[PDB]
Symmetry: C4
Subunit: 192 residues, 4 copies
Amino acid sequence: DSSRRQYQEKYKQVEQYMSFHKLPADFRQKIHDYYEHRYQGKMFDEDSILGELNGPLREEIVNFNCRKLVASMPLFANADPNFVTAMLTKLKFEVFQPGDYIIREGTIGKKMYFIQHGVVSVLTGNKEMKLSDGSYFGEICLLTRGRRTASVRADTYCRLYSLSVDNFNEVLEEYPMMRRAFETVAIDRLDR
Amino acid sequence: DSSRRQYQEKYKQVEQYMSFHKLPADFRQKIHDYYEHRYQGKMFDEDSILGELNGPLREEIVNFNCRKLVASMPLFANADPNFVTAMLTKLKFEVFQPGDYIIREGTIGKKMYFIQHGVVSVLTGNKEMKLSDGSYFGEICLLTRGRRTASVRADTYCRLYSLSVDNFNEVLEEYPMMRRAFETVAIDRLDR
Amino acid sequence: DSSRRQYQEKYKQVEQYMSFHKLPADFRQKIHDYYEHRYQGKMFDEDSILGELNGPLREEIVNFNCRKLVASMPLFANADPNFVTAMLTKLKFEVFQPGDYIIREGTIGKKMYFIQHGVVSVLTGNKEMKLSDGSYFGEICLLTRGRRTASVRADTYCRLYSLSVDNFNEVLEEYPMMRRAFETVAIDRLDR
Amino acid sequence: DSSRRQYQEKYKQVEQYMSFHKLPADFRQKIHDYYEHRYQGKMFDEDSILGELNGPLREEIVNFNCRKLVASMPLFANADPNFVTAMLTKLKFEVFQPGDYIIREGTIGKKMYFIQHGVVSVLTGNKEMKLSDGSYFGEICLLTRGRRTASVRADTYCRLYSLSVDNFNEVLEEYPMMRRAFETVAIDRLDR
Ligand SMILES: Nc1nc2c(ncn2[C@@H]2O[C@@H]3COP(=O)(O)O[C@H]3[C@H]2O)c(=O)[nH]1
Ligand SMILES: Nc1nc2c(ncn2[C@@H]2O[C@@H]3COP(=O)(O)O[C@H]3[C@H]2O)c(=O)[nH]1
Ligand SMILES: Nc1nc2c(ncn2[C@@H]2O[C@@H]3COP(=O)(O)O[C@H]3[C@H]2O)c(=O)[nH]1
Ligand SMILES: Nc1nc2c(ncn2[C@@H]2O[C@@H]3COP(=O)(O)O[C@H]3[C@H]2O)c(=O)[nH]1
């Protein structure tokens, strides 16, 4: 029950923080829902727990939590299992709410995202497109080191895994040939 | 009430610390007032709270807390809202007390400051000048990478937002043309 | 008794974490045993404790904990005691469970391991070999900066001390001639 | 009383830690005395407290705690007060016990020390020399980037302030001419 207690107490700290900065009612309701969707009423010192484990256990855990995400993406499903583990280990779980700008067009992109669950809207000057479970986006800038070619907003609640450009290149340093998978997707999107 | 408790307990740690290092009465009174003005009797693990949020929520919070500061500075008011958010996100809130040397002339400058509320005195060999709400200072060294051209002391209590030279250049890396706003101010001040 | 309490409470956090991610029974049993073997039912803020000490005390502690490991390895036993201390200070204690892949062949190696207690199985295309107390492995890649030449799996429970490639080169920067000890072992293994 | 409580509880964690690693009685007595001399039965989250303050207050505190140390060293007493503050701010308080090797001859030196209180013995092949309150040592390697020219052991309990080579050069980057003070001392010692 110590996990729920930590959540309850922590959220109390949040309410007091929002009250201190006099945040509007609608904004506090948004913060409240984010915490609900993101932690589901439970909190553990994850960093501390995973830090107490060893490489093998941490890799087994991330592989288990991402089993579905993996089987749904040919990128991971047909790849060297060691490549998948290397990738998964670098991912950061993030939750975005409806309407949130995940990626803003024209800005310098330093991360890409894998959709665990949810729907995002991609806008290039017109013609909106949707991406859902099993797809990823934001790879163009990690490859070009340029500026975002489109904006991406969350349509539904989005449970995503982000990957920094540095971690992206680090993993590909060990698995150079996997860069082509990302380039194929980037090329196909740029020629659309 | 957990926010006040944290403050009360933390300040008790401070009193004991000052007692341990045998700090003079006037000095302890100064420390006491700083804590009062800086935290207003409440403390939350801000870093932890903001770290639990996502990019969107953190950006919405800083934009809200700095709404007034922003509208008061043509620098931000007339700029790309994304530039403002990028800037705001890098700021560090700091409180200075009357008489405090914020900037000492002749030293290597590695930060600039935006005045949220308060009055600072700028001294160049003579002719003191005042700056208040809505103005910023310390930009000359961020642009020249040289030495402070004047000293700056807090006149009243000062609620400021500092920006490191590294964060300054990082943001301008994405918004190169905004550097001119700072240069215009630096030029006008150097030619005075 | 505060050390046992910390363990008990921390492990409770683990059980709740594993329950939250719905980990399988066998997996939770594995995690349970790892914690048992790794902490033996006791936990202290080691980093904090050692951080409160000074260089001399920390060096005396690591030398004491590794006295046996040292006397068993000519590498340390016959070396400059200052070299040993420099090395020991960089080691990270790790526990691996039966069947765990400590090193996977073909991957980029960034660490080596010293066996405190346990048996590991080294597999090169065939001909498995065993290494035990007093031996070390993983040195080839720290010297070549290439890819692992063999896989290494824990046979029994393994209590090991790992050394990162950066810490390895850092220590050897001060004790350049000790690199030969590692090269002799790497050469002998590569010519087998 | 919360400062004493933190010490008492923390030291209890230490006793349990030493018991867990089965440290010898004499060693535990040494650890016990170190904690006594170093914290004098009181502990506060100093890093947290100073982190809550601002530049001015932190500088005023370190200047106050080091007032005596400063007036005793012409290096600081006759220097630009801003140079002193810059230096003091980089110092790390450390306590060494009788017989402790502060500096070992022939090793790569990355720090120097200022004696707040205590006596150290400097050994070059023979002719031992003593240094006490108001003196500093270890500057030769910070200037040469070579190897220690002598060993330095604590004679009495030593309350020292260490300065890393990086922080040393950083401060001197802003106060280039102060490097000569250290060179004069290094030259005089090398020609002895
Ligand atoms: N340019 C472009 N990007 C798309 C399209 N569909 C999805 N995207 C993704 O939207 C992302 C926006 O940021 P990036 O430019 O880094 O990468 C882009 C692609 O990953 C498309 O049709 N055209
Ligand atoms: N040199 C100069 N600086 C001024 C003047 N008015 C305000 N300032 C600010 O005082 C600051 C002191 O530090 P910097 O030289 O970095 O930047 C300086 C300016 O931002 C002025 O009239 N002359
Ligand atoms: N190539 C090879 N490695 C061995 C042998 N015996 C033990 N090893 C160790 O197994 C390790 C696997 O990773 P490295 O290639 O870095 O270093 C290897 C050696 O340290 C052997 O016979 N051949
Ligand atoms: N070489 C030398 N060092 C001395 C002497 N007296 C004090 N020392 C200090 O002992 C220190 C040992 O480490 P360093 O060589 O870095 O710097 C040395 C000096 O700071 C002396 O007479 N000769």
